[PDB]
């Protein structure tokens, strides 16, 4: 699993056209104030262990940043070892649930498999932009 | 070399605090209308060949998108095989020059080694977000 952590002043996205056949999530759109935006690429052989490590790390980083909102944003582009879409969707769902056990604020998982426009205003402090890798 | 191609409606950045010791570029800030934003991670053993492949690909993608502005945005986070900063700066400079030989519009290389805030409004069409890897 490869993550990009962007500490945002604001974030918004809107689903456009699908990028699968039947995307597994409904279309939709959402916008946020200050949040940690976590661009999330599920990799082959990401499993339950990987999910728990990533959840714990997002929680711990969020805690030090003092953010109360985390966006889990499915993203195909951070890796060249992708999990298949069906598995990736499932791991993203589990990540979202595992995060709620570890982090007390708002957790929003964006729709999987839709093309989306988005807008972010990313902070420029030293911890505002970080990458993480998790394996098992 | 690992690239992320974001086809933006608008992009802006502002340098905040440095992230090296003496950053090699001056501080500053800039904003743009529609552009291809190319987040660029220089990897160990990126050389002149790599630069020319990447330049040609950015040019060709830009051409099909019909964009007339390319932002080369130094980015440390897309890879786990980074080139050292001094080499990375040099390759980024060469990429910028090699791009001008291949693409006829505005080329802007953002300051290397500064922390920066930024804002992007990224399009949601099917080619708006792509990743590339180049080696030699
Ligand atoms: N292994 C994986 N990890 C995370 N997300 C994945 C995935 N495989 C498929 N996706 C999702 O399907 C859309 C098209 O591939 C993907 N869409 C996107 O990545 C857009 N935001 C940018 O192109 C994404 O929703
Ligand atoms: N191998 C490499 N490829 C591309 N850029 C590189 C680099 N090594 C160092 N940098 C630059 O130094 C800043 C801190 O590492 C980096 N700053 C950034 O990556 C911020 N935009 C986000 O943290 C970047 O300017």
Author numbering:
A (entry chain A), B (entry chain A): 1 to 136
The authors write:
We have been interested in a D-aminoacyl-tRNA deacylase (DTD) fold that is present across the domains of life in two different functional contexts: as an N-terminal editing domain (NTD) of archaeal ThrRS, which specifically removes non-cognate L-serine mischarged on tRNAThr, and as a freestanding ‘chiral proofreading' enzyme, which removes D-amino acids from tRNAs in bacteria and eukaryotes. Both share a striking structural and mechanistic similarity highlighting a common ancestry. Here we show, with the help of structural, biochemical and biophysical studies from three distant organisms, that the substrate specificity in this domain is determined by a differential remodelling of the catalytic centre at the RNA–protein interface rather than just the presence or absence of catalytic water as previously proposed. While demonstrating that the tRNA provides the catalytic group, we show that the side chains within the recognition site are dispensable for the proofreading function, suggesting a primordial mode of protein- or peptide scaffold-based enzymatic activity evolved alongside that of RNA.
To rule out any genus-related phenomenon and to test the universality of the observation, we chose to do biochemical experiments with NTD from Aeropyrum pernix (ApNTD), which belongs to a different phylum (Crenarchaeota), and shares ∼43% identity with PabNTD. Remarkably, the corresponding mutants Y115A, E129A and Y115A/E129A in ApNTD also retained completely the capability to discriminate between seryl and threonyl substrates. Structural studies were also carried out with the mutants of the amino-acid pocket in ApNTD. While E129A mutant also showed a loosening of interactions upon L-Thr3AA binding as observed in the case of wild type, no such loosening was observed in the case of Y115A, thus providing a rationale for rejecting the cognate substrate in the mutants.
